[PDB]
């Protein structure tokens, strides 16, 4: 679920999902168009594609369980949708952590008109 993803993001990065990734660049927190602005935005592009691989799942609301082995995220077995949603969220959280070094506040609340064109998953 979105709320679980937000907690995972905070655990991973130290940043609150809202507002740190809820409106960042062209793909975080909302969009579906344009060239991603930077690595962090690319995390969101890929995460959007990942959810797009799951038509019949409901990532906003469906809850999954996971644990941390040491620092590693281990998705625990639920329904097939839950497992796949968890893997998408895990990847995004890791991706945000891997990019923190180039995260830029200038991309928070990035305006939609600066995001144009289709980028295929």
């Amino acid at each position: 679920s979105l709320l679980e993803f937000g907690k995972m993001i905070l655990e991973e990065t130290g940043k609150l999902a809202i507002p740190s990734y809820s409106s960042y660049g062209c793909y975080c927190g909302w969009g579906g168009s344009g060239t991603p602005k930077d690595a962090t935005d690319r995390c969101c592009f890929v995460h959007d594609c990942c959810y797009g691989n799951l038509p019949d799942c409901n990532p906003k609301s469906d809850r999954y369980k996971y644990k941390r082995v040491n620092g590693a995220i281990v998705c625990e077995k639920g329904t097939s949708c839950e497992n796949r949603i968890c893997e998408c969220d895990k990847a995004a959280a890791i991706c945000f952590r891997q990019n923190l070094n180039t995260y830029s506040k200038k991309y928070m609340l990035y305006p939609d008109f600066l995001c144009k064109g289709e980028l295929k998953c």
Partner: peptide
């Protein structure tokens, strides 16, 4: 309490 598309 919502936040991410």
């Amino acid at each position: 309490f919502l936040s991410t598309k």
